[PDB]
beta-mannosidase
Amino acid sequence: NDTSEVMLLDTGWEFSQSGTEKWMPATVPGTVHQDLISHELLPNPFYGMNEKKIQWVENEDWEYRTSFIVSEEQLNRDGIQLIFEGLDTYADVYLNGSLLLKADNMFVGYTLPVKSVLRKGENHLYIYFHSPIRQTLPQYASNGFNYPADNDHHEKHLSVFSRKAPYSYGWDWGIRMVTSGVWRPVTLRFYDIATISDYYVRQLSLTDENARLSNELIVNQIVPQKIPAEVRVNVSLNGTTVTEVKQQVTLQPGINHITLPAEVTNPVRWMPNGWGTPTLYDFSAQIACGRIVAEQSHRIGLRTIRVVNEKDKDGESFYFEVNGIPMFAKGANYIPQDALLPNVTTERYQTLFRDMKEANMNMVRIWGGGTYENNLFYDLADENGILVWQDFMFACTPYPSDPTFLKRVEAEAVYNIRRLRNHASLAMWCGNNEILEALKYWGFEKKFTPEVYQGLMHGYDKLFRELLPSTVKEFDSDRFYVHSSPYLANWGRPESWGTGDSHNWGVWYGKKPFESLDTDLPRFMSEFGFQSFPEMKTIAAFAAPEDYQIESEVMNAHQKSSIGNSLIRTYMERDYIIPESFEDFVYVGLVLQGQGMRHGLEAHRRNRPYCMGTLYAQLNDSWPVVSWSSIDYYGNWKALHYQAKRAFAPVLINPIQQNDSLSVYLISDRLDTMEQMTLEMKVVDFDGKTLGKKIQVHSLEVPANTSKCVYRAKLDGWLTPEDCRRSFLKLILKDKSGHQVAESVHFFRKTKDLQLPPTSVSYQMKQTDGKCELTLFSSMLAKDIFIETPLQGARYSDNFFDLLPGERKKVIITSPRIKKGEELPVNIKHIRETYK
Ligand SMILES: OC[C@H]1CN[C@H](O)[C@@H](O)[C@@H]1O
Ligand SMILES: [Br-]
Ligand SMILES: [Br-]
Ligand SMILES: [Br-]
Ligand SMILES: [Br-]
Ligand SMILES: [Br-]
Ligand SMILES: [Br-]
Ligand SMILES: [Br-]
Ligand SMILES: [Cl-]
Ligand SMILES: [Cl-]
Ligand SMILES: [Cl-]
């Protein structure tokens, strides 16, 4: 780094309910809710009916205080800067009798010059958080109408007035915890001469032969004199200098703009997950005043990302081109990982990225009702090769567009754009989630006067068609912006499906069968989804045995969608026998969500290039709840996660059966063509015996980045209705020499129509520290087996798979909490067991 010193204001904090004069220890970064919980002043907010029991917190004001020492020597540094990375939300900040700041935007980092107010010895920092509810009640009263924000779970929809995480007020998968606090870190920096307020590595061009960069620095000089300095940029890879440039300047008091070109010959490109290595250069800029007074570095990925959104014969395309190659996007919508943001640990972020990488994903949407994520989130996306689609934090309701609200939004857009624009992973900006769809199709025209509706339509344009796009054009001029997701397509209107991106909620809200995903195709799927109850160990975190019915108060409850638990039963009944026990119903509901959802994922990939991506709703959960998530709050992979992994495999054999006939497609996202390939298939009954003979299709090629049909056959004359109920299709793809590159299994009937034999999955266990190895055997098919353990967060090599007749299967379960001796409890479930 440089000669500055940083003091972390992360200890010795206390908090108070205002007007009580009672102080208790606090943890910062943190939240009022966690501080109370930690003194047993709230029940577990996630347990039972306890949501209503914690609401009172949002009606109180909350105070925070800390003290720190400053030395005579520190006070003699040229400048001293206090930085709040995050204040939630209406925060009056006092230091040593000075009001430093009236903060009003959760999404903004505040940098404050404090030398002239600090004192040798003890220094006293106090922060007063006004209730976001009481702060905005007068605002609402003056408004004359209630914004149609159905996700804001209160009679008055105050959320829209505050630049605060929309989901904190509730959501259709979320608990209401309208929290407050110092949500990101506080630092004091003691420094000489200047600081680097911004360092932007702007890529000018990239070819195989050369990368041209422009290093753009904003330097804030704090002393009264003009100061000769040399600006230096070092570009290194893996600890070795690649290129180095320097510039003489004389820094003036105040802001200085410094621009140094640099080039990297024969650059090593950053590639997305599945296409190579996510190579990151180290770019370091230093200010040297004959000592390095200031330094700032960024990890930089050298790549092009173009979003192609052009009129074509099919409507309007919507796809991503990476390093000149169209890349079919495979991923999911990401939501905040906790009701209480500072509770989400480094480990939890690293684990989530591991989950995305291991599921073969190359894209995550940071959906617009959460937060602009922390720097760590983006750093991990950079180093895992995952593209980031970044919504601005507007979701599902129109918002105000008065001048002072828009000045607030402008502050947050400039802050986060400059914060995020150096990440290799950042791929596009999206003005909002679902707001134009909402304005057009959600029945507002009957909920408000014409003049108010006109006001809302004009407000939409001010923010999402003017302010936000101009801010991106200014500060991130080479990145794509689109005003809303979905921008035109609506799920109820087939005429619009060829136009940009879709949120197909035909499945779920429109009750369409999963098979509808085969015919109802988008140019890009930015949302589609299906709910499930999480597994029992998670339920046991939030419900009691008495509450084990699909619509008791508690489940209902932990159901926040406008049609809920009943829909899960409705869909289940189409394809499965509904089990009589709750635990069995939970198991099949996981299998259900997995099988139906992967059917869509497959349909989207199969239909490339018409469709160029699929991002399911949703990756993750913020609390224990029944949701569209593929990984529950405790990090347990649902069926859907293993199925998404399978559906996103770089090479996939996709058998698709419709109108009593089978097609097999070979789908590849590899960058190289596969030549001289052999598809081989056979029908095997549930006892292990082959029906007929092996079918072989030789001489197959799988070109890079294509989906292609290689086999078709009518069922009639091949299999009888009886066989379709009592066998499966095994499929394998192999190269010239017989090496297997891909396999699949196909069933010819719905699971409820299968004549599944009673059967026992036996296993042998070899348990050590951290590790559990199981070998599973069944003489007969066991359908969609779930290997269930009580260890929260335990990870599995595979799970939610069919255990084929006779064919042994190795599964490894890992967890730091696995001890040698202490045999891991294991419960193996499968479909036939769920009914008599
Ligand atoms: O109700 C399910 C989803 C519909 N689309 C929204 O963007 C998302 O936040 C919702 O959870
Ligand atoms: Br200062
Ligand atoms: Br400053
Ligand atoms: Br200047
Ligand atoms: Br990829
Ligand atoms: Br952070
Ligand atoms: Br626009
Ligand atoms: Br069929
Ligand atoms: Cl960065
Ligand atoms: Cl009105
Ligand atoms: Cl099928």
In short: The longest strand covers residues 194-206. The first helix runs from residue 32 to 37. Residues 649-750 form a domain with the Immunoglobulin-like fold (CATH 2.60.40.10). The pocket of bromide ion (ligand 7) is lined by residues 465, 469, 483 (CB under 6 Å).
